[PDB]
Amino acid sequence: MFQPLLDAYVESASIEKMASKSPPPLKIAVANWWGDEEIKEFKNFVLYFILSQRYTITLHQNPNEFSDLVFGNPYQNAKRVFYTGENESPNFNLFDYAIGFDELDFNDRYLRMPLYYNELHIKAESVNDTTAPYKLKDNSLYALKKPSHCFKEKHPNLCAVVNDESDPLKRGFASFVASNPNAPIRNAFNDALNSIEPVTGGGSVRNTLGYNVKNKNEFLSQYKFNLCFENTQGYGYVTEKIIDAYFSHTIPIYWGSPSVAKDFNPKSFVNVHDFKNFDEAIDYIKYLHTHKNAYLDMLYENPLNTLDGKAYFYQNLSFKKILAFFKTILDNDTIYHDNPFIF
């Protein structure tokens, strides 16, 4: 159920504005190779957005300045914050701090931030609309920016099956929107799942349709199931793929993170680790399409777990908690990473 999954991130975005518009400044360095179309990504994905409210920012494509937010992986003796999207371990001998998906900890030295807070953020960059279903909090961080109308034309069916101007069981079985081959679990599972009911591909891999899809979310809304396999297996490797399936009034058939039920509710989606073998991963669904009174619940289930009434994110993923990492970052200036003293 996406409506709480959006209303929840909004409360995790609950912060206080600043005293004056003398916002404490900041200097940022990145990997050498990133570009304006990837630096607009740097300013558009969720991280710069939270530095956009507390601190003041000016970016640097020159290592000819000494700075505080040094990202990337292209420098030796500086103040360097990690930040990934791919499955990459953290190495605190070259860097200082880390933003990963490891269900880890290193005191004030690691900040697990899965890239499912970027599509969650980013899913709120489209709902600031007059022709949108999912609701923001009034005069919140996202409602403070001017509204638009690019939503009724893009999504006419995703705008439908959610608001109950249409049915969810009068749609199709499974859809496949993977485009990368190096993922043997992601690919193969199209085999088995298909020999029981057709599966629709939309990438370069197992492409069933006939056309390559431009809007990935209008796609799944015409389906009753989405397949959310990551490219590689990783405890915490839960990305935006699950989100683009929750957002689409469909069911994610998830596999990749052997520790996923912490992140989101194991009852609202199909978790493929929750099985002893693979043919049970196919059994779970064949009970749900057929006996609809059981397809409702999972479909009508909250992505998030609950707390004596209240619904939450795992490990208190919030706008604030991230700051109790960066504030401590700015703060202690111990050069943990090996002081580069070549012989």
Ligand X SMILES: C[C@H]1O[C@@H](OP(=O)(O)OP(=O)(O)OC[C@@H]2O[C@@H](n3cnc4c(=O)[nH]c(N)nc43)[C@@H](O)[C@H]2O)[C@@H](O)[C@@H](O)[C@H]1O
CB of 37 to a second copy, least distance (A): 5
- The structure tokens 């953290």 sit at 90
DSSP letters of 65-78? S--SEE-S----SS
CB of 144 to a second copy, least distance (A): 18
> Is-contact 269 254, C-beta < 8 A?
yes
Q: What angle do CA 275, 279, 263 make, to 5 degrees?
A: 35
> Which is nearer to a second copy, 155 or 337 (by Cβ)?
155
> Dihedral sign, CA of 207, 208, 209, 214?
negative
CB of 217 to a second copy, least distance (A): 10
Query: Which of 305, 107, 282 has its CA nearest to residue 193?
Result: 282
214 binds ligand X (CB under 6 A): yes
Q: Which residues, in sequence order, are CB contacts of 225 under 8 Å at separation 6+? A: 173, 174, 175, 250, 251, 253, 270, 285, 289
| 231, interface contact from a second copy, ligand X, none, CB < 5-8 Å by kind | ligand X
Query: Which of 216, 193, 240, 229 has its CA nearest to residue 5?
Result: 240
> Which is nearer to a second copy, 158 or 281 (by Cβ)?
158
212 binds ligand X (CB under 6 A): yes
Q: Which residues, in sequence order, are CB contacts of 1 under 8 Å at separation 6+? A: 268, 299, 300, 301, 302, 303
| 209, interface contact from ligand X, a second copy, none, CB < 5-8 Å by kind | a second copy
Per CB under 6 A, the list member of 22, 64, 182, 334 interacting with ligand X is 182
CB of 156 to ligand X, least distance (A): 17
Per CB under 6 A, the list member of 1, 94, 196, 205 interacting with ligand X is 205
Closest-approach residue to ligand X (CB): 183
> Which residues contribute to the site for a second copy (CB under 8 A)?
33-38, 41, 85, 148-150, 153-154, 172, 179-181, 198, 200, 203-205, 209-212, 214-216, 219, 222
229 binds ligand X (CB under 6 A): yes
> Is-contact 213 178, C-beta < 8 A?
no
CB of 71 to a second copy, least distance (A): 14
Q: Report the alpha-carbon distance of residue 229 to residue 201 in Å, rounded.
A: 13
Which chain residues interact with ligand X by CB under 6 A?
A: 177-183, 186-187, 203, 205, 212, 214, 216, 229-231, 239-241, 244
